[PDB]
Design a binder for this molecule. Sequence first.
Ligand SMILES: *[B]([O])([O])[C]([C][C]([C])[C])[N]C(=O)[C]([C]C1=[C][C]=[C][C]=[C]1)[N]C(=O)C1=[C]N=[C][C]=N1
Ligand SMILES: *[B]([O])([O])[C]([C][C]([C])[C])[N]C(=O)[C]([C]C1=[C][C]=[C][C]=[C]1)[N]C(=O)C1=[C]N=[C][C]=N1
Ligand SMILES: *[B]([O])([O])[C]([C][C]([C])[C])[N]C(=O)[C]([C]C1=[C][C]=[C][C]=[C]1)[N]C(=O)C1=[C]N=[C][C]=N1
Ligand SMILES: *[B]([O])([O])[C]([C][C]([C])[C])[N]C(=O)[C]([C]C1=[C][C]=[C][C]=[C]1)[N]C(=O)C1=[C]N=[C][C]=N1
Ligand SMILES: *[B]([O])([O])[C]([C][C]([C])[C])[N]C(=O)[C]([C]C1=[C][C]=[C][C]=[C]1)[N]C(=O)C1=[C]N=[C][C]=N1
Ligand SMILES: *[B]([O])([O])[C]([C][C]([C])[C])[N]C(=O)[C]([C]C1=[C][C]=[C][C]=[C]1)[N]C(=O)C1=[C]N=[C][C]=N1
Ligand SMILES: *[B]([O])([O])[C]([C][C]([C])[C])[N]C(=O)[C]([C]C1=[C][C]=[C][C]=[C]1)[N]C(=O)C1=[C]N=[C][C]=N1
Ligand SMILES: *[B]([O])([O])[C]([C][C]([C])[C])[N]C(=O)[C]([C]C1=[C][C]=[C][C]=[C]1)[N]C(=O)C1=[C]N=[C][C]=N1
Ligand SMILES: *[B]([O])([O])[C]([C][C]([C])[C])[N]C(=O)[C]([C]C1=[C][C]=[C][C]=[C]1)[N]C(=O)C1=[C]N=[C][C]=N1
Lengths: 181, 181, 181, 181, 181, 181, 181, 181, 181
Amino acid sequence: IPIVAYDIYSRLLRERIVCVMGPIDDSVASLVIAQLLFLQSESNKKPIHMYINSPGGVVTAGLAIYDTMQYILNPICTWCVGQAASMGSLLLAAGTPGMRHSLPNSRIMIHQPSGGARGQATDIAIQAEEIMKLKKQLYNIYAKHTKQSLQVIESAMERDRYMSPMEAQEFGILDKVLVHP
Amino acid sequence: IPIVAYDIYSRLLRERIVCVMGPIDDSVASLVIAQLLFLQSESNKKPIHMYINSPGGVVTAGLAIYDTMQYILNPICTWCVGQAASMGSLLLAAGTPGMRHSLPNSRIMIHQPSGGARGQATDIAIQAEEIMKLKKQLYNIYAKHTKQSLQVIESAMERDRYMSPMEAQEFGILDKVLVHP
Amino acid sequence: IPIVAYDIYSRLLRERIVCVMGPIDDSVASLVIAQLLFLQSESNKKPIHMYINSPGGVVTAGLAIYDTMQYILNPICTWCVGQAASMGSLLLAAGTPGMRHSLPNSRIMIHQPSGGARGQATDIAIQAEEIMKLKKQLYNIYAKHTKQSLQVIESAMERDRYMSPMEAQEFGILDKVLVHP
Amino acid sequence: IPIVAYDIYSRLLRERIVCVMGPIDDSVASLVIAQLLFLQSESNKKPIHMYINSPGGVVTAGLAIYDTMQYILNPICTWCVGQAASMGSLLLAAGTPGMRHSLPNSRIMIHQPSGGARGQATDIAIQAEEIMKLKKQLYNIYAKHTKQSLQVIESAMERDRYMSPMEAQEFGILDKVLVHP
Amino acid sequence: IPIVAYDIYSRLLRERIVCVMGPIDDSVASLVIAQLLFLQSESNKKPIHMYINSPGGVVTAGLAIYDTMQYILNPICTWCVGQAASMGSLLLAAGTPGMRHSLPNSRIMIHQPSGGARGQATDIAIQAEEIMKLKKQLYNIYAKHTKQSLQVIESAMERDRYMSPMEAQEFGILDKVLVHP
Amino acid sequence: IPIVAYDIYSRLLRERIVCVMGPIDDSVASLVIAQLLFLQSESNKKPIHMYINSPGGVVTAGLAIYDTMQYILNPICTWCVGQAASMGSLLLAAGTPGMRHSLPNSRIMIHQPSGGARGQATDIAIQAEEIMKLKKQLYNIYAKHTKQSLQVIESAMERDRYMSPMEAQEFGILDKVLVHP
Amino acid sequence: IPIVAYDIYSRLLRERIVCVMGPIDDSVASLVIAQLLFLQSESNKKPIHMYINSPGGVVTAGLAIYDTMQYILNPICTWCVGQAASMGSLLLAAGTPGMRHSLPNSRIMIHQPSGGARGQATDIAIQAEEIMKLKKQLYNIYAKHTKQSLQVIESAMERDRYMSPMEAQEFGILDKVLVHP
Amino acid sequence: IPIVAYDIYSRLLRERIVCVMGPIDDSVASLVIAQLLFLQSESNKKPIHMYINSPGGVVTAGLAIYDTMQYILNPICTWCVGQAASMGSLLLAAGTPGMRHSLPNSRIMIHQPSGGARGQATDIAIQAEEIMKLKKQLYNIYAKHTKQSLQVIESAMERDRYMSPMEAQEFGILDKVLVHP
Amino acid sequence: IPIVAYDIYSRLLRERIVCVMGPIDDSVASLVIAQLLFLQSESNKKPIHMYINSPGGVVTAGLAIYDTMQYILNPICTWCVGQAASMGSLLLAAGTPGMRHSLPNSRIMIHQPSGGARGQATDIAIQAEEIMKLKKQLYNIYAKHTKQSLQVIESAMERDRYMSPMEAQEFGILDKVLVHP
Ligand SMILES: *[B]([O])([O])[C]([C][C]([C])[C])[N]C(=O)[C]([C]C1=[C][C]=[C][C]=[C]1)[N]C(=O)C1=[C]N=[C][C]=N1
Ligand SMILES: *[B]([O])([O])[C]([C][C]([C])[C])[N]C(=O)[C]([C]C1=[C][C]=[C][C]=[C]1)[N]C(=O)C1=[C]N=[C][C]=N1
Ligand SMILES: *[B]([O])([O])[C]([C][C]([C])[C])[N]C(=O)[C]([C]C1=[C][C]=[C][C]=[C]1)[N]C(=O)C1=[C]N=[C][C]=N1
Ligand SMILES: *[B]([O])([O])[C]([C][C]([C])[C])[N]C(=O)[C]([C]C1=[C][C]=[C][C]=[C]1)[N]C(=O)C1=[C]N=[C][C]=N1
Ligand SMILES: *[B]([O])([O])[C]([C][C]([C])[C])[N]C(=O)[C]([C]C1=[C][C]=[C][C]=[C]1)[N]C(=O)C1=[C]N=[C][C]=N1
Ligand SMILES: *[B]([O])([O])[C]([C][C]([C])[C])[N]C(=O)[C]([C]C1=[C][C]=[C][C]=[C]1)[N]C(=O)C1=[C]N=[C][C]=N1
Ligand SMILES: *[B]([O])([O])[C]([C][C]([C])[C])[N]C(=O)[C]([C]C1=[C][C]=[C][C]=[C]1)[N]C(=O)C1=[C]N=[C][C]=N1
Ligand SMILES: *[B]([O])([O])[C]([C][C]([C])[C])[N]C(=O)[C]([C]C1=[C][C]=[C][C]=[C]1)[N]C(=O)C1=[C]N=[C][C]=N1
Ligand SMILES: *[B]([O])([O])[C]([C][C]([C])[C])[N]C(=O)[C]([C]C1=[C][C]=[C][C]=[C]1)[N]C(=O)C1=[C]N=[C][C]=N1
């Protein structure tokens, strides 16, 4: 990591740029929330830019970031660079309307959640009930921000669904596919 | 394994004695069914003795043995030696009425089934539905042979429930606790 | 393995009983085919009994057994004991019409094939084309023996589909659910 | 970890924000207590904000934090971000009354403690007695802060019990579910 | 294993000699019970000789053997060769009165049972209750055959208690310490 | 492996049936050659039946079998059961003209050889020259028995090429696709 | 570890607070002694606060800390936070009389030392003699600071003995159980 | 890493030199994009120099860098040092026309993408469709910057194709092969 | 690493001394090139000293360094300390004529390149062609700087060829063997 607020990510932080890179877990989520709360405290008016290059991650860690993005007053511009899959595509869609961007060659992928269950039949019934609830929760989120109906969402996310940026724009995950500024 | 129809288990087979020992898996189940079908073909009238010392095992392997025991015409005497837990307690209860035996110091344990699930939320919902069906199936079997109501069965099997032979007799899992012949 | 044509499976072979137990691989398939060809050479008229307790296995190994069952002149009675999943459910359905049996508590499961692919994009395109062809092949087989239409087959096998013996009979996988002979 | 009191968590510390993130162990507990004692020494009047995103952890480490929260004079606002399970849900409930918050999409889970025992029968009897005492201890804590009766607590925590924020508010684990400030 | 009913242990079986050697598990217990039932069927009058050299083993496997020894009509002579610890000392004490032997340099050891427990606090409470019951069970057995009071048994077995053959005879575990026949 | 010249493969050997099953290595090749030489010595006139279910194997081991098949005077009938890939498809094609068979659902696959090289640049140049020679060798063999030109062979084997039995017959790998005898 | 004498533990050191956290080994002991000697050199009059959250540790490492606590002139206040087991409970008891504190929900555990021995019988006799001496040493220490007789100490520490803070106060391990300052 | 903006890579950053070294993954891509955005913000007019020594890497990580290079207004000079294979050769070709350089002894390699697929046949069909789309995408990129037709691109990239710098210049991957400045 | 531009290698960098130590890989090559470009930018006239102690390394990483040495305008003095084998001997020979040095007891070794190949026969033919080209490339480099004919080079490098400094000077790898300055 190179040095220029000294190391390169801190130097970008002064620009109000937050990088969401790689798998999203609790540690990653913790960091991003900290930066979003810091950037809100520096000012509640200036936009924040979130650059997303992620294969996905943990649902509750992603929902933590998503709630933080909704809760802070700042407008948030989201940028898909390279890929946005699972949680990364959800966070991309959660950007302020008219402020959700992709580069020309990024890939978007959406799908239903996956997990596991163990134990006695009663413990398994509880855990299956919980992942079903989370599935419905996530589908509501995607319906809200993309404006697609629940039926469309359910049909699209049953299996892995890869999108080009133009397809994603048509779907409602993002607003602009920009080549040059 | 010692030699006396030559090795000691084959020598017992001539007595119409089948040994169900240790964990019950497909291989074990395969063997026991083979011996039961052989002993039926040698005669459909003479009783068979099943000696059970088992910690439990795979549900479908156990249900395979259980169905074989019901299907053949021979009366089957069951003997609890040492322990009968999970499937072993179910097979013990499945013996011909009035022919289900324990030695004085054997332990019986009954409980609900356990397992796992993996994959997408839809795959998990299917697998949880399947272990729930198996649970209801097994509870019906225990209710049939012990004469307890379903409510009693459900209450008893929610957690691990260890029994002395006298308790098991009271429950209806077995008929006789014998010290000497 | 006990001794009574001496060991218990050889002793059953004299009864024209073939055991298909556990995962189906090339070795298992090799054995079963050998026994079927032997039993045909001993006589082409007498029925053969195939007892199936299997979680599934390799497609080509299973198709090897399936072709052997069709090719020999003998009628083949199939028996589901414990479970028939994947290839095991297909082999169960491949028994001579009116001769396909389940015990009361067996579970049947049907689903589409699964696999993997690796290499260059051209190698992956070839391997995906091959598993697609195998899927269509298998669906034709199930349609033939169950008399369901292809559409029904495709709908049923998209995900894991567990069946009781009565459901399986309704589906057309088997003819008789027998409690006692 | 980015740099802006220089690194991002230290920069939040100046805001009197303590982050309780991931599994709670002795090291984590040590850190949180240190920060709480530091923030009390900086002033005993100003509130402290505890942001909780935790799957749970060690009972004594969690009880250490819980006692520290009760002992210091400062009011403590608790924030559920993402999830609060086991100890995390207990620490969330331990916040100053009227000051316990969740974001809209957080999950709360409550359950009884789990552990192990080994050794001679006398050693096992001691260890089982100890985890039983800890269970009663924890149930008293939850009853105190949620105002539910012990009977309700015992019924709810026998198995894993997941809650939405509104359900948690109804239960008494938290006071406010906030979308925007 | 050398050959002389051909291999050396089978050749001893014709003498009505059963060898209980090494750790006692289900497999070992299965074998010994099979031999005891065979030797009873050959005649119910002739004594059986059990030669014991064991460090101990599984409680239910040992109790299986112990019940078999009580159930068969034959008198059983027990021989301590080398050591009898845990279950081995219990099986030695279970021989027919006046027929329990040690060689001059054998060691006897008695102690309480050991085990483990895991899971939720409710599961641990059940498992601890079960090992306590087994402890009381075993102490009753030792009191019966040695004629010591329960209080003496409890005091002696709290910790590992090694005995010479003469001490064991004084205790009541055995009757004769023989140098030459 | 079951017993009926006693075990099932030996019992088939008396029928002049050789089984080529699974991966082809030196050991497998050794066995098959031994059986072919034995069956020739029993008579040079009677046909031999080779049943092939193989994923492939070592080139020199396969070429060993192939040369043996050409060298012995007996006509050889080849049977594809399940699959014939790599060497297995070559051995299938090497059967006596008009005597090469597939079952209806077998898969045939043909491809070029694969391997590795290591060492100094001079050692690598030698090893690459050797696998190139082997490639040309094998393509000549396939051209001979299928009657396709070298150009066709080279085009077909550049990548993995799966065939149905009818396609294989069209290609010239086999003569008859038989459903029933 | 966060930064505010800069990192949080150094910042507490300026308050004369020493943290004894987790397992006590030579490294941990080295650190604590260094801090105690530093804090004595800064002044011999001002009290030191030792916060203890420990599962236990090495006897000689703990005795090193204990001797340092006795040797320095400063009064030492000890605080049980979360747990004090083994050496942690001993160090808690070693605080200046009237200055030994617990929070309400801490657990105290006392027990005898444990270890191992290896080698020749002479080497084992030496090592057993050494752990016996250490046991007597430790029991004298506990008797001194708790004012219990040796007999009481020996009885209490034979097995693991868990205490609530009030029980510990009654025992004499600590003076005050404080809820709020 | 040596120190002279202090460490050697930061010291080069002040020269507007970005190093793309070794395998290209998300972390590497993240860093390079950060530096490119920083260098654009320092001025949009001054050229950037990208030094490439890479064996290749992840497609989406590489496409992320490639899109960033196109999006920023600065001209970008690319330098092949040592090797440019896979993504490294693509990034080399993506430099500003007339500004793409190689040293005399660098090797360029181009080839099609590689990957894997797993799961059900439907999941495999989706994943194969996705790598096919990515292949077409990449071939369009190479056609754009090298000015070769798609047919030429497809023919060249079917297998690994190594190039000297002069060959690469002829192909259109680069403009200048420089010995001295 | 000790501190005196602060750590010892940075302190030498101010002397225009670059250390090439141990195996040469991409990371090592990256560092050396960075330092050479930095030292050129500080001035294009002042010589650079390269101290070489290397067992060898990756060809393209070494060729990267070699091209950098040729490209920069500065004269480069090379010093063999301890050993120069493979790439290390090539880099030693690449120093400015009259400026290539060895200490008295250094060992030089030259040999041909080594590697590996895998895959289909076509992939292996490509990879063997590539290592052959690299071999010819390297032999041209050695011929250029040592002034030996290609025939001499080929003969010398077929096997490992160790040289004393005087032998190396005779060969033309270096100019001066210095005892004292
Ligand atoms: B995605 O592919 O990243 C996807 C999120 C999408 C639905 C918005 N991720 C998941 O579904 C994860 C997968 C995972 C499981 C286990 C560890 C790490 C990642 N599922 C969960 O996180 C999860 C959480 N609670 C219950 C079940 N599954
Ligand atoms: B018992 O304790 O043996 C119990 C049977 C009882 C309910 C009559 N066994 C099980 O429940 C087993 C546990 C197991 C799981 C996995 C491997 C081996 C054993 N459960 C199952 O076999 C099972 C089968 N299908 C679905 C889910 N679980
Ligand atoms: B079943 O669940 O057993 C199922 C067969 C069903 C469709 C009649 N099995 C498979 O689909 C197997 C799974 C498997 C993969 C790899 C090793 C072992 C088992 N699939 C294949 O065998 C296969 C074969 N060729 C290509 C792809 N997949
Ligand atoms: B929770 O799920 O985090 C839960 C706490 C809840 C009851 C408030 N955690 C536990 O119960 C832990 C689980 C655990 C065991 C072992 C290592 C780490 C975590 N139990 C204990 O910590 C514990 C402590 N002492 C005795 C027994 N169990
Ligand atoms: B002895 O030392 O062999 C002793 C038996 C004695 C009391 C007559 N053995 C045990 O107590 C065994 C130890 C053991 C545990 C686990 C695996 C193997 C051996 N205890 C048990 O077998 C047991 C059984 N059920 C519950 C708890 N412990
Ligand atoms: B096939 O897929 O089985 C194929 C044979 C076909 C061309 C008739 N097999 C091979 O090409 C084998 C693959 C292999 C390599 C290493 C171990 C085992 C199998 N190739 C060789 O055996 C081989 C032999 N000598 C040199 C190079 N490769
Ligand atoms: B306690 O549980 O931490 C306890 C101390 C108590 C008696 C005040 N600890 C010990 O007894 C330790 C256990 C241990 C053994 C080996 C490594 C680490 C910890 N015993 C000893 O340290 C020890 C030292 N010398 C001889 C024997 N045992
Ligand atoms: B090259 O050799 O680096 C090449 C890129 C070229 C086509 C411009 N790389 C790939 O094709 C990579 C290989 C790889 C696979 C898995 C992990 C790391 C690298 N392929 C992919 O990244 C990929 C991505 N999505 C789907 C399939 N393959
Ligand atoms: B030397 O011994 O360091 C020698 C270089 C000499 C010819 C100037 N090294 C090599 O030949 C290396 C060996 C190596 C292989 C694999 C990893 C690391 C080192 N060969 C190569 O680097 C290479 C590169 N491309 C193709 C084949 N071999």
